[PDB]
């Protein structure tokens, strides 16, 4: 298998504008949303049909109950942060938890919080501690580190549970997640002349595109086009150089491709 990851986010907004939820939580496998919950629906729902087909109603009912509690916990924590900072009005609180299962079988796990779009508290599961960015985060770190059972529980969740959930979801979504759609690559020429190496129709989104000169020398001043979703489940990207024999090199999912420009 290629590298894969499982992540969950929580977003809390105090005093939100009309129609905007106070709380949202979304799960992802790689770049695919798999689950969603918000303070308006108050229901955990699938975001992928392979999630809906493989998880019985008891899964969605149990996690809906957990998310209604996590939602109230997020509201209380954000109100307490605003009191610590002496902040009024609308502020944001965010959380991201997740794990990676690498190609070589090794794993990584992470848990962190943000306040108003900046890193606030970062968990270290090896030293079993919280890294605080300022004095307010230090007060919270002090309270959270006093609960040693909770730190151990989070280390087990990241290292064992998260990975077991990821393997389970990877199997449910195998036809989507473990597929390969090779790129369709072309070179176009656009008194400044540029060569554009453009790729589209590929999956997974991870791709390496570069320009080389006279075989083995990588060219300087390459511009890159972001890897973007095409909207049909595939991705597109490009690499350009200003104009010696040039070739575009593309690496995607273990396959290396060369387009020599005459």
């Amino acid at each position, epitope marked *: 298998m290629r590298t894969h990851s499982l992540r969950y986010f929580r977003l809390g907004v105090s005093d939100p504008i009309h129609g905007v939820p106070e709380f949202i939580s979304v799960g992802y496998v790689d770049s695919h949303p798999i689950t969603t919950y918000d303070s308006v629906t108050r229901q955990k729902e699938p975001r992928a049909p392979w999630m809906a087909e493989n998880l019985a109603p008891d899964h969605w009912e*149990r996690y809906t109950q957990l998310l209604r509690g996590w939602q109230q916990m997020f509201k209380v924590e954000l109100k307490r942060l605003q009191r610590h900072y002496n902040h009024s009005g609308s502020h944001t609180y965010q959380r991201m938890i997740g794990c990676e299962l690498l190609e070589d079988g090794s794993t990584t796990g992470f848990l962190q919080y943000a306040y108003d779009g900046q890193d606030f508290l970062i968990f270290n599961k090896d030293t079993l501690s919280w890294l605080a960015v300022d004095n307010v985060a230090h007060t919270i770190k002090q309270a959270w580190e006093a609960n040693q059972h909770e730190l151990l529980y989070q280390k087990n*969740w990241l290292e064992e549970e998260c990975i077991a959930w990821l393997k389970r979801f990877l199997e449910y979504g195998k036809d989507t997640l473990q597929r390969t759609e090779p790129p369709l690559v072309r070179v176009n020429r656009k008194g400044v002349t540029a060569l554009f190496c453009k790729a589209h129709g590929f999956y997974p989104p991870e791709i390496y595109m570069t320009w080389m000169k006279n075989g083995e020398e990588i060219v300087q001043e390459i511009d890159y086009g972001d890897i973007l979703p095409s909207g049909d489940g595939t991705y597109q990207a490009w690499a350009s150089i200003e104009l010696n024999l040039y070739s575009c090199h593309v690496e995607h999912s273990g396959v290396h491709m060369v387009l020599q420009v005459p």
Partner: T-cell receptor, first 108, second 113 residues
């Protein structure tokens, strides 16, 4: 979905008693031991979620996640240790399940 | 600061309505109701992970709960039957994913025809 512990255990005061708990659950978020004296409420004794032995006074709690196994060890048994000992597991859906409990009888 | 339940003892004729009270001032979000019977241990009836929501346990039939507020979790027997003869325990924990249970004293209920 299955928590097994012996129904009863008897040992002499001053000795040791090891209470085994085996579990089969979908996912694992920790294992708890509680003590319940006859006609009283259960009270928390220990929590284990990583592997190994945790000591707390005369009581030790061990966990092996790969074996789905824990023990509660009561050392230098006292008459006041006669009680029911409950193991409980919080599974991957955060559902807490209890075993039937082990009644420990300390012989004078 | 603790958790208390009432009544601690009751004899009830079959068919009667009965509510067991449970209150805690520890600001715990998660509350639970268990019944305890010989050879079966503690079996969850209903639970609540926070004010405003509740879920079913392992043996919910013949019972209902409400959780309008954080402090209170009443268990109702709409029409008591003899099989509901048991020892009932209410419990609370900081959250469903965090903390140990704190149990109430227990309520012994005997339902007789």
């Amino acid at each position: 979905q299955n928590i097994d512990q012996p129904t009863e255990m008897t040992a002499t005061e001053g000795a040791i008693v090891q209470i085994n708990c085996t579990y089969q659950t979908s996912g694992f978020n920790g294992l708890f031991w509680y003590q319940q004296h006859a006609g009283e409420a259960p009270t928390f004794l220990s929590y284990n979620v990583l592997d190994g032995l945790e000591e707390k006074g005369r009581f030790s709690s061990f966990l092996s996640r790969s074996k789905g196994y824990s023990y509660l060890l009561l050392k230098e048994l006292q008459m006041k240790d006669s009680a029911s000992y409950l193991c409980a597991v919080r599974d991957g859906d955060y559902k807490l399940s209890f075993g039937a409990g082990t009644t420990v009888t300390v012989r004078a | 600061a603790g958790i208390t339940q009432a009544p601690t003892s009751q004899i009830l004729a079959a068919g009667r309505r009965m509510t067991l009270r449970c209150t805690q001032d520890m600001r715990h979000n998660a509350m639970y109701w268990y019944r305890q019977d010989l050879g079966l241990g503690l079996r969850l009836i209903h639970y609540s992970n926070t004010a405003g929501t509740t879920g079913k346990g392992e043996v919910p039939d013949g019972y209902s709960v409400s959780r309008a507020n954080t402090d209170d979790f009443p268990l109702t027997l709409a029409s008591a039957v003899p099989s509901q003869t048991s020892v009932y325990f209410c419990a609370s924990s900081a959250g469903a994913s965090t903390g140990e249970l704190f149990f109430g004293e227990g309520s012994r209920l005997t339902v007789l025809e």
